Design a protein around this ligand. Structure first.
Ligand code: GTP
Ligand code: SAM
Ligand code: MN
Length: 259
């Protein structure tokens, strides 16, 4: 059992009040009041983030932790927050975005955020059924939380394997992907082998709730994986009992227009 495995167990043994107190204490949270209102009105002419995923990728890019460039693929794009962010970036030439949900909350949201015209959204697609094609940047934000740590670990290994397949197709592609359960030994071993073939490292974004151990792997950074993970498991464990609330910050506005 790792530090992260104990974090999972303490999280599962929270009452409902304790869970809600814990999940957002000390994290950054974008104020989505205007974004949510426009989305629920059906306004399409807006650059505000279509999801909270947009600020996570923005944070990684503004820190210099990812290279978003060329032909971009978004594997598991959901509402499209990463797709829209990427399509707004200068070095990005096009985005092919794929997601399984065909309608509802997790289908792509269609807005005029800057560079929207460079995005091709393919809903109803399972990316594990897809043969990799050419890409300069591969992004993947897939990994569904589960109370079972072993299930989180396997979901994470499936994403690492998918990234290996796209990297075999595109050996010099920049990669950025969610690592849902980096605390599992089987994930660390798969991720260390990825790191030893392709380079890269693991980071925690400050917008991630404490109710998930997710970290983001990028080929553009470096650092010891086990040390990065241990630091974050310790922090997640420390935050149990922490009573500071979330820290509200402005939501991303990428502006509107074609590129
Ligand atoms: N103790 C406790 N743990 C929970 C509860 N709900 C979820 N969890 C745990 O916390 C994890 C996070 O699940 P999520 O629902 O994705 O967390 P969230 O921060 O609420 O985000 P949303 O799903 O968007 O609402 C789950 O895998 C469980 O391990 C709960 O009601 N009580
Ligand atoms: C965490 S969301 C990504 C959000 C996105 N980065 C954003 O900023 O809005 C991950 C998405 O992947 C989708 N997904 C999970 N498994 C998938 C699969 N096998 N194929 C395609 N999409 C998948 C889920 O429906 C979910 O909408
Ligand atoms: Mn929940």
């Amino acid at each position: 059992m790792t530090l992260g495995d104990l974090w999972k167990r303490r999280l599962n043994n929270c009452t409902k009040e304790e869970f809600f107190a814990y999940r957002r204490t000390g994290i950054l949270e974008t104020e989505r009041d205007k974004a949510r209102e426009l989305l629920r009105k059906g306004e399409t002419n807006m650059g505000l983030a279509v999801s909270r995923g947009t600020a996570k990728l923005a944070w990684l890019e503004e820190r210099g932790y990812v290279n978003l460039k060329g032909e971009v693929v978004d594997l598991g794009c959901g509402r499209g927050g990463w797709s829209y962010y990427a399509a707004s970036r200068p070095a990005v030439m096009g985005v092919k975005a794929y997601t399984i949900g065909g309608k509802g909350h997790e289908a792509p949201k269609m807005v005029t955020s800057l560079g929207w015209n460079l995005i091709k959204f393919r809903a109803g697609m399972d990316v594990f059924t897809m043969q990799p094609h050419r890409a300069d940047t591969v992004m993947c934000d897939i990994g569904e939380s589960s109370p079972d740590a072993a299930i989180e670990g396997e979901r994470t290994r499936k994403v690492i394997l998918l990234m290996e397949q796209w990297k075999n197709r595109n050996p010099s592609a920049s990669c950025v992907f969610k690592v849902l359960a980096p605390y599992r030994p089987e994930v660390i071993e798969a991720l260390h082998r990825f790191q030893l073939q392709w380079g890269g490292g693991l980071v925690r974004t400050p917008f991630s709730r404490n109710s998930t151990h997710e970290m983001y792997y990028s080929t553009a950074i470096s650092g010891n994986i086990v040390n990065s993970v241990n630091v974050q498991s310790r922090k997640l464990l420390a935050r149990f009992g922490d009573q500071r609330g979330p820290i509200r910050v402005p939501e991303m506005d990428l502006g509107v227009g074609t590129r």
